[PDB]
């Protein structure tokens with residue numbers, strides 16, 4: 458099965474998922490000088506006040522914080538989007554070292570980690586249908602750098618010991634994802650894909666310019682998670698990121714000058 462090791466990592470994925478070599482794969486390098494301001498883009502609308510978190514799950518690749526997406530409770534709208542996209546889950550990608558971990562890069566700079574808030578277009582009725590459409594998902598990407606702690610991240614960090622291994626989950630209600638956002642909602646946007654198998658080309662990427670800062674202790678706790686199941690030899694969950702893919706026939710747009 459696919460993963461992030463030498464024998465099953467990103468360079469192997471194309472054998473089971475040929476779209477890995479497609480026309481709109483993610484992540485990409487964001488060349489800041491080549492991205493163009495699009496004055497027609499609208500401010501993002503991030504409406505998370507009624508968000509209902511449910512559960513946190515170690516799925517063997519990352520951990521997902523899952524939300525109730527059976528009503529319009531936490532939605533993303535505006536920006537490059539038409540219509541309403543519901544938050545289904547968030548998760549992170551991160552490195553074994555502070556100098557790597559992000560999936561998108563900025564002028565080839567790698568951040569320590571990257572948060573993905575995953576939303577699906579309500580016109581398609583459910584997430585499974587949405588991923589089959591070119592405008593099915595909107596993923597809000599936020600970079601993490603190591604410095605001061607992020608207070609809004611700590612509740613996530615503290616539950617990780619309870620989901621150390623693949624397949625473990627824990628109740629995770631009443632978590633407010635607003636605490637993971639930076640001050641500014643300035644962003645870059647481009648059409649892309651899921652960054653793990655099945656690599657479907659269904660995502661409008663919205664990547665925030667401003668990173669959030671997390672502490673060395675916070676990211677160290679991410680790196681104590683395991684890819685393996687309980688009762689299996691330990692494989693630390695680190696370096697669960699796909700590298701930058703070719704931009705091909707795409708233009709990255711900026712919401713800001």
Ligand SMILES: Cc1ccc2c(n1)SCc1cnn(-c3ccc(S(N)(=O)=O)cc3)c1-2
Nearest residue numbers: 516518573575588596650651652653654655
């Ligand atoms: C282990 C694992 C994780 C995720 C998925 C799957 N398996 S298989 C079914 C499915 C459908 N979408 N999707 C998803 C994949 C990637 C991103 S990201 N990283 O935000 O582009 C968001 C959602 C997954």
Ligand SMILES: [Zn+2]
Nearest residue numbers: 549550573652
């Ligand atoms: Zn992701």
